[PDB]
């Protein structure tokens, strides 16, 4: 209300391709976490429930990043069998 307008979260439409600009705006909000913040703010999340959700997400992130690292680590083994028949 006291900041300059048409600067924050503003995407310029290029050559009238509104579809690309809106997806760019949507992705920027998602990456900064604004989209997920708004949804959880629709109904109040009690402090006990928020900590349980945060702990679940933090544990989820650790498992997701560790499993992703192993998949990339073992991806080089996805080649064909070099000892076929043995």
């Amino acid at each position: 209300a006291k900041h300059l307008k048409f600067i924050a979260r503003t995407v310029m439409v290029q050559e009238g391709n509104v579809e690309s600009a809106y997806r760019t705006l949507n992705r920027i909000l998602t990456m900064d976490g604004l989209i997920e913040d708004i949804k959880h703010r629709r109904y109040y999340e009690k402090p006990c429930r928020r900590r349980q959700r945060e702990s679940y997400e933090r544990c989820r992130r650790i498992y997701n990043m560790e499993m992703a690292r192993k998949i990339n680590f073992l991806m080089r083994k996805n080649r064909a069998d070099p000892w076929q028949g043995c």
Binding site: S55, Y63, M65, M67, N78
Partner: protein, 117 residues
Amino acid sequence: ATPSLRGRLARFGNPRKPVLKPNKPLILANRVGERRREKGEATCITEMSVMMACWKQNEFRDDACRKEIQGFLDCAARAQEARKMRSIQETLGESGSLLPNKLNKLLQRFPNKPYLS
């Protein structure tokens, strides 16, 4: 970089209060989650809206709305063909990430061992 797990969990050595309370042990499994099908959405709503708009203006006469009717009819043909191709060719084509069925075969070649052998 993976977030550190030193002192996060409540243990015997840890003097501080726990940071994470996982309902399951933090051990990598031998399987990944199967691919989740996309939730269905209504298609050709825009073309349907345009076609139905002219009917209100032209008293539901098809002769005066031939161009808009064909536009919606063409969209349904494309949507039906794309849906069949996406469900069959794209799923079988293995486009993008590796399929979970093939990924699980690679994972079981190098199983995670949380025990001592």
